[PDB]
A paper describes a structure:
Bestrophin-1 (Best1) and bestrophin-2 (Best2) are two members of the bestrophin family of calcium (Ca2+)-activated chloride (Cl−) channels with critical involvement in ocular physiology and direct pathological relevance. The bestrophins are a family of Ca2+-activated anion channels consisting of four members (Best1–4) in mammals. The overall architecture of hBest1 and hBest2 resembles the pentameric assembly previously shown by KpBest, cBest1 and bBest2, and retains the two landmark permeation constrictions, the neck and aperture, in the ion conducting pathway. Ample electrophysiological evidence indicates that the neck and aperture serve as dual Ca2+-dependent channel “gates”, as disrupting either of them partially impairs Ca2+-dependence while disrupting both makes the channel completely Ca2+-independent.
Numbering used by the authors:
A (entry chain C), B (entry chain B), C (entry chain A), D (entry chain E), E (entry chain D): 2 to 340, 347 to 348, 360 to 365
The structure:
């Protein structure tokens, strides 16, 4: 993730111009290789036309150039690319919203799972750790960065998310499917035990805990579903073929022809297809943004900070339910007990 | 479902090019027959024009070709196809989200339906099996693959989803409508019996069970509703007619005319309508993707893995509520009891 | 509703071609009269030009034809029609989702309203009947088919949805507004009485009943709101005028002119405006689909099966809460007590 | 609101033609003045060109007309207008859904706030009146029609929504912000008092009451938010300027030039820019529909019936919670105790 | 925020014309500098062409002007700008809806946290202050205006949102991440203490309090998420480059050429590119609106009134839970105890 929200807080005279100087997360970084390849093929064709081909071959090449310039418009590149990019961006933001966060759960646990003794600390810490462990399991399933951080379950155990007895129980479970859900079942069982023990003081608190657990588990499952059900491969293939075929057609039909032949709209030889290069920049860049966003759990610059989120979530959960439990400041009268640096339209 | 999420985790230089070599779930697999038929008709017309027709017939054919090339644009193919494909894709993802999953229910059941004896196991297993049975009934109603797997209720009984006494009760029920909802009513009655027996320890736990059951049942009903209320037949007919009429018009108007006649934009005979073939590829492929996605419960490559989901859901449910019930590891102090391979914009 | 979901389960070679042979719910059925009228006016104009008008009148008519062919594009028909049709289709699916269903309520009632005696049956049956009666009242308010089935409240009483004492109470209520909500208030009062009687065993069950009742009542009210707040009349008028004016302009400007005059793009007299007829087919058909979908509660082929849904809902509700109450098969060990015809991307 | 839902229940041969004869809520009513002004300016320019200007001035005017006809397309009128109108329509339907309705609250109150004596009637009536009063306060804040009906709080008191003691408490509250929320706090306090008194029999009923109250209050607040956060003024200014500049350009460039000069596409003087008038009709009408819908709480024909809704809501609430409380017909066996005027795709 | 909702309550003859005279929040204010710069560069180029260049240089410049006028259309400015602006506007309204409001919480607290003594006042005031403090912490994290108002935590303490003992606890918490969530954990702990003390009379009231707290905390977290996950930098760069390159191309290709050369569509020298200036106005203004809306928490005219909302929320919360607690007017019979200044379609 490359944040620039502060740089654009106000609409200024040089508003988005200063963002053109950024390299990390930029279009230049994603596109300079493809732009160089396109320019190289174009200049190879141009050099062949200018220096290699004979006169009759040049006339045939000019006819082919005019033909391909005229009929390259039949490719619905904008049509297919717009549909694809809209689909990808919608999936991208939805996938970000699907990352499980322990904040609601840690608030409920701190308010509902009681006891200053070691057993209450154990209960709260273990419930939050089960939530974090489910998040880690699904994230290493769906994110290449998290997988590189946790390539084995041994790594997860060594990171403190799973104990060794829990590891024995986890691997002893007979299932051929992804086991990210197992800590959620552990959470339900442990919450039931805590309620039966009296650590959870009422059935409504247990119900609230289970509801928040199910929200968290639903987010994990939604991450799994997005990972499994890709954007349909046929759409990806079609948009890739549209871009490729259109720009090969442009490699042919955007060539500068000899102005001495008097071809219409061919009388200025600039030797560099600046507008064709710009059009490639925009269309291929749109496709590259979809390429980067289609799996936001990879290791692109603008891909989500999954490992950072894991660390933040674990630290904040443990702070909230262990250090902060029953640790309020004394009830104090505030400053305005006895009370800077629109009403409506029709009034 | 053809997953390629890992292949596109990062935006690479050969980003989507390597996906063009895939055959299963590809545009080539869905479109090669139609492309061959279009090319065959085009070449039949071209051969007739080149070898069969007389000179005056050729002149009339050339006039007709110019006319149809000019006025084929009056067909709003892009207009109708874009609307249709957007509608289909939205319905497709919504339908995937409507498939019932037992994960929330299994967590609630494991946390709320109690007893290590055989009767508690029976309660938990039977509740999860009722959920799975409702899912199977609606899926065999709406999915051709699931129907081929369960062509009769006898098959459902032999798969273990329904017992024979339950089969007698099920077929003895007098209804002319789909009975997918019956196991949900069985679930409500059994949950009430469990609460009355004391296996469910509180009324809030029963309420949570019923709420999750109603979420599951609503997903089953939404599957039924999507199956019943098709995309309006008139839209399908209109987009099919638009594509067909436009490409018959192109079969006429994209023909290569004799360059000796000096017709404008007709001076290069390439003998193969490469750009017309590409345009057919893209437009007919868009329509074929809608065709494949319109019923995502069939047996296309990218159709949903309904039978796999049935098997996974049943196995995971039975694991969660029977093997994993009250089977926690002992409460253990974690690694960070005494504590790898952004704050905000305005700060 | 004309369902064809099974016919399109798989994307086949003759995928959507076989749907072109359907008549019920088809574009041909909705559009053949308008297409005939357009063709008749076109041929009347063509006959007048070919046989009636003098030479100077023909020259003026040709100038007018060229003018209207050129400047008919100034009408933003595609612009207005696309907006209108998207709005209509979104409202259409939302309206289908707003039809009240008793399934959640019948599950809750079967699980919460208890007693095998006649009084418990009376309670459950009456609660489900109040829900069904509210649905019937709003549906006959908003659906012409349901109104034809229930043109008076006497018809509703004779159908068994309302008793005669309930009819006296209902008509004795002093209100000038639609009374569809009255059975929902009856439902709340009866649920409160059942809880006070002990038939509902706990306050959380009563709360769940009231929440599901409020979901049902909200769906009825949303049906009323969609019926009241039409698509803005000005949009309907504007799109109708756009279509009409554009196609009158085409009646003028698509006429075949005498090829002997050497007008550009006028040298082939086909005598039948096949592409203009196709364009009318597509644009007027789009408008006709919006026309049919704008009120999905009428008696069009693809309009919702409201009376079928009423009958199904009543039958299923009465089955669920009366025949199926406390009628479980004995708890039996399933087939897999001692256990046919993807893990993740980063693994 | 101008309802025509019944007129379009079925797609008929004269489907939308009969809606063109309506005047209230029509495009003609909203647009005839602007259309007359545009036509008057056009005819003033045409008269000046035809009768006033000299020959050289006519030649310069013709050159200017050709220039402005060519380059008026550079104004992205369709681009900006489509975005703006989509935004406005989405906000419009969302704003309608945000109007608070007391139906859920009246059902809950009738089912939960008990007592046939005068005190129970007082409780139920006062709770529903607090809800209605909050609705009235926010509506007179946001709706000009409701403000004209209630220009002072004295008018609200005289309408029976607020008592005089409540008026003293209301105006004695020290706040510079809109006080629409005050009756909701009164509602919470009164519900707590009723529960403490025993009129509300259980804590779950109180919780349900507070949840429905918070839904109602959230709808009131959402009305306030929509009133405050307008569609960004810069979008309104930009679309207004786009329309105005484009149609001034058309006033210049759509003028009929002397056909004797042989200007291309200028050889038929119709003296009336029928297609330009139609284009103005459609584009300016689109803008006028956005103008009417942007504040749906004004006094346009298609603006919401806010005062009617206030009256209906108050009457129905008082009927539901006072006249209908504990006023059920005796539990009676229905007609089908001993039982007119689709199963699935894969079956 | 620049509200003009009242000015557009009705669609009037001078409907949006009167909004063109506004300066604050206007397009003129956001765009006059860029428009002046574009016009200055255009006139510099025009002066060079008219007065500086030689005849052969003029001919080459004219050829370049024609080339750039023709091929500047290859830049998909409308394509990229429309996508970007739609994304920005959707994020903008979602971000407004994400601002936390204490209204639901203050209603619940006033109805559930009891006691007229000083301790009950302390409880209610402190809970509402914790909510407000969480809102302030996240807002100063995400909003530059709120940060300028609260550049240090000392400023927050001096504003009364945080006490000094709470400040010691807050800074003593060991975390490297944003601590906006800490007052929510304080809220949960204090609510648990109040329930254990008997100030909260039932477990369902505590559950409702925790649910509303979690809604509030989720809104704060969603503000953090929107601040962190910017609109992808590559989209911003691409749209900025598209606009810039297109309008530099127009600086070249919109130049008025010498009409004596007889270039087609170059025969009227107006010396001022009025239509090019208008096109720049619209396209660059669209981009500037996205620029202003992309971070709606800055200090633009139409940016949200975050500090006003902070003050309003705190004042209203303290009024609702302290001044208004258990302060009802006596239950009084209303005016209509013994009872001004549509039924359905199918009836
Ligand atoms: C292939 C072509 C496309 C790429 C070229 C795009 C421009 C090149 C990058 C800009 C310079 C780097 C950013 C920067 O560092 O530059 C900020 C500069 C001074 O810093 P600041 O504090 O003003 O911010 O200010 C500004 O760029 C503000 C003024 C910018 C001009 C606004 C447009 C109006 C004039 C129209 C000209 C024709 C095209 C639009
Ligand atoms: C009818 C025409 C359309 C169909 C033809 C499309 C292209 C043919 C398929 C590509 C080869 C198969 C995929 C593959 O196996 O090929 C991966 C290759 C090496 O493997 P890798 O490890 O680099 O990945 O790498 C790459 O293809 C990366 C470089 C690709 C070029 C990027 C475009 C920039 C140049 C512009 C040229 C004009 C059109 C865009
Ligand atoms: C005004 C013009 C528009 C209307 C005319 C549209 C076509 C006429 C209706 C088609 C026949 C009735 C449907 C049917 O009963 O026909 C199914 C047929 C055999 O039955 P089946 O078991 O194969 O299915 O199969 C098939 O139609 C499959 C092959 C269809 C061809 C696919 C397109 C590729 C070739 C391009 C030709 C140019 C236009 C696209
Ligand atoms: C500036 C130009 C635009 C404005 C002019 C639009 C037309 C004028 C208004 C129509 C008459 C008033 C409505 C009415 O009262 O008229 C209903 C009429 C008989 O009553 P009914 O019971 O049949 O309904 O029926 C019908 O209008 C049904 C037949 C209508 C024709 C359908 C189109 C097919 C023919 C194509 C002609 C070229 C343009 C589309
Ligand atoms: C670069 C060009 C674009 C910018 C120029 C746009 C117009 C200039 C601003 C208008 C005057 C300031 C607003 C105002 O204060 O002016 C309100 C005026 C009298 O006040 P009121 O009480 O009537 O409101 O009334 C009215 O402007 C109502 C009548 C307005 C005419 C409606 C259009 C129909 C005629 C078509 C003309 C061609 C273009 C559309
Ligand atoms: C861009 C993409 C990559 C490269 C490439 O694909 C697309 O670009 C294509 C363009 C082709 C050339 C077009 C024109 C001619 C003239 C012809 O002359 C006929 C005889 C003559 C004598 O009188 C009649 O007038 C000889 C062949 C030649 C040079 C083609 C060679 C192959 C080329 C380079 C193709 C190559 C594979
Ligand atoms: C399609 C919709 C329904 C029908 C209809 O509306 C639109 O279509 C319109 C077309 C009109 C005709 C256009 C051309 C001429 C030539 C003119 O000749 C001038 C003199 C001449 C002598 O030298 C100068 O050259 C005489 C009149 C005539 C025939 C029009 C008659 C009315 C018609 C049929 C209109 C009719 C009401
Ligand atoms: Ca990525
Ligand atoms: Ca399929
Ligand atoms: Ca209809
Ligand atoms: Ca209005
Ligand atoms: Ca801003
Ligand atoms: Cl609850």
């Amino acid at each position: 993730t490359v944040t620039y929200t502060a740089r654009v807080a106000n609409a200024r005279f040089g508003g988005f111009s200063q963002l053109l100087l950024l390299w990390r997360g930029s279009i230049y970084k994603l596109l300079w290789r493809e732009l160089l390849c396109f320019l190289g093929f174009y200049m190879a064709l141009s050099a062949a036309y200018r220096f290699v081909l004979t006169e009759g071959q040049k006339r045939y090449f000019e006819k082919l150039v005019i033909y391909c310039d005229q009929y390259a418009s039949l490719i619905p590149v904008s049509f297919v690319l717009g549909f694809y990019v809209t689909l990808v961006v919608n999936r991208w933001w939805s996938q970000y919203l699907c990352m499980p966060l322990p904040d609601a759960l840690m608030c409920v646990v701190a308010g509902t799972v009681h006891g200053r003794d070691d057993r209450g600390r154990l209960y709260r810490r273990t419930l939050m750790r089960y939530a974090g462990l489910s998040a880690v399991l699904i994230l290493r399933s769906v994110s290449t960065a998290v997988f590189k951080r946790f390539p084995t379950i041994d790594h997860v155990v060594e990171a403190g998310f799973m104990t060794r007895e829990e590891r024995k129980k986890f691997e002893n479970l007979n299932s051929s499917y992804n086991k990210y859900w197992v800590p959620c079942v552990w959470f339900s069982n442990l919450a039931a035990q805590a309620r039966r023990e009296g650590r959870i003081r009422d059935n409504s608190a247990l119900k609230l805990l289970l509801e928040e657990l199910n929200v968290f588990r639903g987010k994990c499952g939604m991450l799994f579903h997005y990972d499994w059900i890709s954007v349909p491969l046929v759409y990806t293939q079609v948009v890739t073929i549209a871009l490729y075929s259109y720009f090969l057609a442009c490699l042919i039909g955007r060539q500068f022809l000899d102005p001495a032949q008097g071809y219409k709209d061919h009388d200025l030889d600039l030797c560099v297809p600046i507008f064709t290069l710009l059009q490639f920049f925009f269309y291929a860049g749109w496709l590259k943004v979809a390429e980067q966003l289609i799996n936001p759990f990879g290791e692109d610059d603008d891909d989500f900070e999954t490992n950072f989120l894991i660390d933040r979530n674990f630290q904040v959960s443990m702070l909230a339910v262990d250090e902060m439990y029953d640790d309020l400041a004394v009830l104090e009268k505030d400053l305005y007990w006895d009370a800077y640096t629109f009403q409506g339209s029709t009034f």
